[PDB]
Design a protein around this ligand. Structure first.
Ligand SMILES: Nc1nc2c(ncn2[C@@H]2O[C@H](COP(=O)(O)OP(=O)(O)O)[C@@H](O)[C@H]2O)c(=O)[nH]1
Ligand SMILES: [Mg+2]
Length: 666
């Protein structure tokens, strides 16, 4: 027997500018691969299929489309990529953005000039622009027969044969000889191809010299080596829509894209912090990454995983190293184009879905019960730095918004719901504009919740900068009785990020013990709104140390208020100050636009940390206030002729300069 072979795995992702043909190309890969296995929602995060004895796991799901969380993780999870270019989109400036991503995560790729049928279809413009702008070193693997409407065929220039397509349905294909008017062009590019292969094979170099045509297999193997070691980009061509070229692209996935053997081992960290390489050994200890959780309308919660080492067995227990608990793997599944398949196991190099696993979230590492504890993804609590207010038009929209968030907080445990202290509205808080922007689209559409949605707003905080010693006195005859509460507190600043710290130095019934929770609750509520701009108070330690009470007039109501009053007083007395989030920012740019990107970041109150090169591009690292980063994606495209791209992570909170302090009151 046999079925699992590591050499025959081909984990891929299709990377394309929006509208280039990612989806159509994927659908067509799924149609052609599913033909043999028929006479003996979609899409899923990973969809398996078969071609010429090889298993191709097609990694997607994102959604989005700027969402760096989903993109990073999905790149570690695939081994190789097909970058689809639109042949008819002339400049295609943001098609560069997705190339930079593949370069960033060191993923071997082939290219597919995908709309040859269309008006404007220009293979050569794709090759030249790949050369000049991306520094990709493309190698022409195919030549088109016909142009635009009359696009009828494709020449494979490696093997010196061609194919004609008798229809647009993908149901008539015939190995033809290279026709007359194309044959000279094929000889030129075939020996250009042989020339490129000679750089990664000394045997082929010696053959090229003599004019001896090398063996097809030696040629495939040399282009493959150069592809996998990131020195060339084989280019193929077609119309996905008109079912021309998609079977040859599938051949290229097997010929040139990597198995999980061919790429460097994934890097992981022990709990000790020692970095280690994780080899794809199916009989080794299990190590696996959850990279997408998925609600399902049949089997329920599905966590999609990539096994890097060992074997994951259905009916086993695995250890979630990020959290600290055993979980039960109930079942394993592969998602095919039309159907599900139950499987007994997923070995190293492979991907699928596990039912079970209730407490595992995206990015979590799963290892064997008695296996080395490794953490693949670096741990980080991502800060809710952006809030959006949201008001349902009726009471009927209130309860189905409450369901929209409690049900969407389980798939995505990374946002934070609350209620504005001085208004009373629902406030979703998250890692960015676009995290909240698509939560809002899932709310109004998928959960049918129409609501008055407010401007995105940065999550400012407030704190004090010197120690203070203050009172709160609530003493009133209100609502038919006397009320009395009296607190004294020392408040002092805590180290940035340390949070909140309450200390009871009440020494002798000076405030009766029964009212001590009341004063804490008062302190708590009053910290929700600071004196400067009404935003939460953080990073302080409060110490209750004196007070008084009245024999009959004191109450929890009175001491709570006395607590609020004391906190209000202290924050205003304590040289208060606004804290804003500061983001880590990596901008990728062409070098001619590079001085202009630095200057613009400095005008945004940025500090430049340092730039290193990435391909023919340049990666600038910097700190900038998130408050200064609004509308940045458009402003960056303006100063890079659309070729730039960035990613943005929370780093720390810092004290705003007093010039900004004044601007924020209104
Ligand atoms: N004319 C032409 N259109 C295509 C081709 N491939 C895809 N499209 C169309 O381009 C549009 C966007 O396609 P899609 O695959 O969804 O792009 P995506 O956003 O990158 O997933 C769709 O309406 C497709 O039908 C092609 O080969 N030729
Ligand atoms: Mg799509």
């Amino acid at each position: 027997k046999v079925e699992y072979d590591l050499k025959r795995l081909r984990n891929i992702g299709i990377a394309a500018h929006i509208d280039a043909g990612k989806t159509t190309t994927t659908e067509r890969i799924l149609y052609y691969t599913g033909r043999i296995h028929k006479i003996a929602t979609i899409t899923a995060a990973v969809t398996t299929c078969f071609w010429k004895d090889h298993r191709i796991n097609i990694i997607d799901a994102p959604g989005h489309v700027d969402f760096t969380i989903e993109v990073e993780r999905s790149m570690r999870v695939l081994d190789g990529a097909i970058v689809v270019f639109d042949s008819s989109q002339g400049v295609e400036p943001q098609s560069e953005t997705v190339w930079r991503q593949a370069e960033k995560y060191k993923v071997p790729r082939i290219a597919f000039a995908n709309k040859m049928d269309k008006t404007g279809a220009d293979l050569w413009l794709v090759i030249r622009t790949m050369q000049e702008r991306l520094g990709a070193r493309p190698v022409v693997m195919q030549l088109p027969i016909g142009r635009e409407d009359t696009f009828s065929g494709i020449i494979d220039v490696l093997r010196m044969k061609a194919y004609t397509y008798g229809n647009d349905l993908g149901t008539d294909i015939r190995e033809i000889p290279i026709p007359e008017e194309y044959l000279d062009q094929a000889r030129e590019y075939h020996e250009k191809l042989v020339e490129v292969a000679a750089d990664f094979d000394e045997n082929i170099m010696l053959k090229y010299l003599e004019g001896e045509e090398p063996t097809e297999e030696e040629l495939v193997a040399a282009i493959r080596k150069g592809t996998i070691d990131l020195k060339i980009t084989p280019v193929f061509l077609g119309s996905a829509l008109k079912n021309k070229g998609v079977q040859l692209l599938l051949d290229a996935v097997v010929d040139y894209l990597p198995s999980p053997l061919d790429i460097p081992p994934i890097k992981g960290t022990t709990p000790e912090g020692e970095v280690v390489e994780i080899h794809p050994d199916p009989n080794g200890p299990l190590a696996a990454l959850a990279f997408k959780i998925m609600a399902d309308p049949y089997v329920g919660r599905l966590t999609f995983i990539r096994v890097y080492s060992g074997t994951l067995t259905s009916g086993s227990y695995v250890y979630n190293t990020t959290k600290g608990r055993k979980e039960r793997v109930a079942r394993l599944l592969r998602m095919h184009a039309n159907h599900r398949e139950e499987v007994e196991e997923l070995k190293a190099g492979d991907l699928g879905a596990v039912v079970g696993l209730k407490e595992t979230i995206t990015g979590d590492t799963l290892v064997g019960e008695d296996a080395p504890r490794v953490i693949l993804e670096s741990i980080e609590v991502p800060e809710p730095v952006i809030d959006v207010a949201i008001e349902p038009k009726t009471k009927a929209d209130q309860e189905k918004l409450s369901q929209a968030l409690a049900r969407l907080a389980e798939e995505d445990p990374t946002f934070r719901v609350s209620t504005h202290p001085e208004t009373g509205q629902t406030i979703i808080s998250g890692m960015g504009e676009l995290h909240l922007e698509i939560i809002v689209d899932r709310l109004k559409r998928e959960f049918k919740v129409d609501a008055n949605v407010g401007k995105p707003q940065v999550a400012y905080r407030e704190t004090i900068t010197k120690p203070v010693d203050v009172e709160g006195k609530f003493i009133r005859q209100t609502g038919g009785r006397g009320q009395y509460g009296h607190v004294k507190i020392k408040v002092e600043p805590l180290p940035r990020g340390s949070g909140f710290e309450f200390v009871n130095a009440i020494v002798g019934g000076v405030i009766p013990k029964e009212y001590i929770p009341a004063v804490q609750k008062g302190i708590e509520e009053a910290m929700q709104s600071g004196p400067l701009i009404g935003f939460p108070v953080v990073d302080i330690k409060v110490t209750l140390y004196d007070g008084s009470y009245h024999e009959v007039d004191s109450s929890e109501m009175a001491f709570k208020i006395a607590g609020s009053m004391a906190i209000k007083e202290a924050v205003q007395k304590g040289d208060p100050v606004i804290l804003e989030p500061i983001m880590r920012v990596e901008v990728t740019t062409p070098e001619e636009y590079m001085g202009d990107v630095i200057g613009d970041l400095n005008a945004r109150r940025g500090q430049i940390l340092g730039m290193e090169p990435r391909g023919n591009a340049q990666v600038i690292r910097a700190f900038v206030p998130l408050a200064e980063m609004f509308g940045y994606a458009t402003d960056l495209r303006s100063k890079t002729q659309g070729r730039g791209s960035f990613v943005m992570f929370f780093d720390h909170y810092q004290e705003v300069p007093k010039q900004v302090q004044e601007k924020l009151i209104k």
